[PDB]
């Protein structure tokens, strides 16, 4: 049968799926480990035990225990991102997408899931992967991974809890496609693991990652990278806010033995109510447990590893939206409302220069507002929110994915780079906010295609050439149709620094990505603050 | 007789002389001191003892002793600037035109030369106040002062060289014509005294020292204001040069009675050959012996003074060219040449940043670095070249007068601001150089008027508009005409900050003189040198 599948770990039942008038062959559910439940909470993962009989992969799994965003009940907007499953400490698994009929050896695609290392769910609407896998014919993956406390919860020297066990159950799942896609259709020696956000600061670190790396042939970050200010901490941070997490709780905190058997004993629900309260700073754009700079997962700081080459060489297709930080400003800034133009007035444009650069001292403040005023102007409302929203963005996104690119591009063997600027015509943020975190997704994933969503034919037109970029990178390493008479999407080099626009118009390439305020936020400002 | 004047120090005749198909009276030479010579050198100015007879002043005196430019040898654009007079130390003398008929109760315009305080002379052919006198009937005076070592040697805590005594002599000679200058047909309590450059900052001294202030009524500040940075320096730092110079001439350093000693003893080109060498750091536009923070002559330090309004309140009139640098970098940085486009490379841009800021650490002058490239074309040489322009001229003169002209408005009776941007059409420097220091002088001075010079009919009107600005706000304290229909030039306020373009165009009104740079010239970058 077109549904049954034997594995390594066992048989498989999988369920056939409706797309776009016709169908394939979808797997959810697939357990890739034991479930990370009592006394294994906060370990590293173990191998699932295989298992007799068929497994029942006709349903979506449960989704990881994780914070769930309240701020705006009922609005579509906020809610397509929380779980639409039942949160679990069971829920690592992962879902396959096979075209039909089943192929013998073709393109991998994995998909890592991004929500700043707190949140996120492979079983989102956005991240169906049918319509992919359907309309580039490949085999589409989706794994999951242990977020907040539960996956990155660090108490370096401890094997209880030693740290970056979420990035281990990615690593996992990769594990068993590596060892498993080729029952299913799929060329193990060819495959793409892509990811947004952190999912994209995911993808980033196996390709430092000495044990990664062996895994996966290329890859594919999108708004997010390995290097971003607030993907990853050193371990005194780390073991600093897990003793504060354990005295939220009132827990024993003479010894780690104390402190994470008390934390074993804690609902999950119980763990991420008190999550927040142990940020250093007063902050937007910072997450509680993160990766973390261990020397084991990850040999030596980042920097030093970008430095000298100390990484996967393959090809890279990554790039950006337009307005990475109005989401981040919308939640935890003064001054903005999802209801309201937001025009911000001075007071709250250096409030909010502040909490977006939480570790800075005064003259590092100083130095960004500068950086971002326009002096002959300064008090009108929609300059300062545009500064803001850029800041915001430049500072945890496109500097750092800039300063990877470049360093990457010295060893590598080919990248690509897009800025992804085009506004989907249906979005229900304001339109203060811009192209949004995360919403370059929807045009990956194609939900374009389907008529019901309301998408205009360019919107189509654009989700299908994204999609055809993304597929042919995964198969080729080149995004491009060798014999084409379509524009060409151009190599990114140490020289030429080019890059092209992603929207609904006619390609454009351009050169230096923000150089001016990347020089700024990758040369002068940490040069400042460590003299200072 | 119309030349027979008898004034308080004894009788002058002046001699009849030729403007524009007509004639005024000038009397040139008047001694307002006793010739500052021999043991007197370094000493603050004594009056001029009255003499019997008449003093003949039909011509030119002796310029005061200098460093002579010879980098160009027979350039006119250099040698303009130079003595056109015989040197010597025996210079303090003043001239004055008067029209014909001679006025009752006139305005007076007292012309301050300029030339960074090391140079100078009143005798020449741009300073001709004949044409400014005869065209908007005023009495004209240009004085003289000691420049260099004999004008600004500083040994605080002995009287024999105090320093500061090239401002006194501009003070002996203003207390002349207020005691004076009725007998020439001049209201003594109607005198502007005005100035370029080193010219500017002694008024806007003047304006600072409380010995000055009621010896004048307004005053004009052109391209120069009394905090730029180099206008003058510590007690400390003035000794160290004063002990650095006798050094060069093997004097005995024991005592300041031994040192001065040493230096009275040595011909007046022997300190000028090694003045030079005192400076503390490898520079431009910073000169060796210029006015000191003493407590006497400045009461406090002079931000001090600007902050607590502590300065003569009345109307003021300043503006700054186009091009301020350009001159510098002409004559001490590398790359730049009098014959040649000077297009700069990075390598040239950033020793020219290291010479624009000597006393910048190296945070600063990558603070500055960052804050005049565009890195979207870093290896454009036009853009380097005027990029270092306008470093030059942005932290020597224009943003330091703009701090000066906020801090002065606040307690001040009426500002008026000018931005000046034209190029002259027969100017002999290169096109590279622009709008150039010093260069608006001559349409002050009505030189255009003159055919023979070779000016465009715009640029004579261009005069007469300027020749008419300064002297109506001369005797009125407004540059406009009451009930006129021209443009008007409007008040600048602490509110608004409006400022006009001074061309041969029809006037346009801006607001904020170059605020970016200025915020980051005046706010930012002395933050940050003093915190690191």
Redesign the interface.
């Given at each position: 049968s077109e549904l049954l599948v034997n594995t390594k770990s066992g048989k498989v039942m999988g369920t056939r799926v409706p797309v776009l008038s016709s169908h394939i062959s979808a797997f959810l559910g697939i357990p890739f480990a034991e479930p990370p439940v009592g006394n294994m909470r906060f370990r590293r993962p173990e191998p699932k035990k295989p298992w007799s009989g068929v497994w029942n992969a006709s349903t979506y799994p449960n989704n990881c225990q994780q914070y769930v965003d309240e701020q705006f009940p009922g609005f579509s907007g906020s809610e397509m991102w929380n779980p639409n499953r039942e949160m679990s400490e069971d829920c690592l698994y992962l879902n396959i997408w096979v075209p039909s009929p089943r192929p013998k050896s073709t393109t991998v695609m994995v998909w890592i899931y991004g929500g700043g290392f707190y949140s996120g769910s492979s079983t989102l609407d956005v991240y169906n992967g049918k319509y992919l896998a359907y309309t580039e014919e490949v085999v589409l993956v989706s794994l999951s991974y242990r977020v907040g406390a539960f996956g990155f919860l660090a108490l370096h020297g401890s094997q209880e809890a030693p740290g970056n066990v979420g990035l281990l159950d990615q690593r996992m799942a990769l594990q068993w496609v590596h060892d498993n896609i080729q029952f299913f259709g799929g060329d193990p020696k060819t495959v793409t693991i892509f990811g947004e956000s952190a999912g994209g600061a995911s993808v980033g670190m196996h390709i430092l990652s000495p044990g990664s790396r062996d895994l996966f042939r290329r890859a594919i970050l999108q708004s997010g990278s390995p290097n971003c200010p607030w993907a990853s901490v050193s371990v005194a941070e780390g073991r600093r806010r897990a003793v504060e997490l354990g005295r939220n709780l009132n827990c024993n905190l003479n010894s780690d033995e104390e402190l994470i058997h008390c934390l074993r004993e804690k609902k999950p629900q119980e763990l991420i109510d008190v999550e927040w309260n142990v940020l250093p700073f007063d902050s937007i754009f910072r997450f509680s447990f993160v990766p973390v700079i261990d020397g084991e997962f990850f040999p030596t700081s980042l920097e030093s590893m970008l430095n000298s080459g100390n990484f996967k060489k393959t090809q890279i297709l990554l790039g950006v939206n337009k307005d990475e930080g109005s989401f981040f400003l919308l939640y935890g800034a003064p001054g903005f409302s999802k209801d309201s133009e937001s025009k911000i007035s001075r007071e709250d444009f250096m409030s909010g220069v502040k909490l977006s650069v939480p570790h800075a001292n005064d003259?590092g403040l100083?130095?960004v507002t500068?950086q971002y005023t326009?002096?002959?102007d300064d008090n009108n409302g929609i300059k300062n929110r545009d500064g803001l929203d850029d800041i915001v963005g430049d500072h945890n996104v496109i500097c750092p994915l800039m300063h990877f690119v470049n360093k990457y591009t010295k060893f590598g063997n080919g990248t690509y780079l897009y800025f992804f600027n085009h506004r989907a015509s249906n979005l229900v943020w304001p339109e203060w906010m811009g192209v949004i975190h995360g919403y370059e997704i929807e045009f990956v994933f194609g939900l374009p295609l389907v008529k019901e969503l309301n998408y205009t034919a360019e919107e189509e037109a654009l989700s299908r050439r994204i999609m055809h970029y993304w597929a042919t990178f995964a198969k080729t390493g080149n995004p491009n149709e060798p014999h084409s008479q379509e524009s060409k999407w151009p190599l990114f080099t140490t020289k030429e620094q080019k890059f092209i626009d992603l929207n609904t118009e006619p390609m454009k390439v351009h050169?230096?990505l923000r150089?001016?305020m990347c020089?700024?936020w990758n040369?002068?400002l940490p040069?400042?603050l460590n003299?200072?």
């Open positions: 003259l100083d130095a500068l326009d002096w002959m050169q230096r150089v001016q020089v700024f040369q002068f040069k400042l003299a200072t």
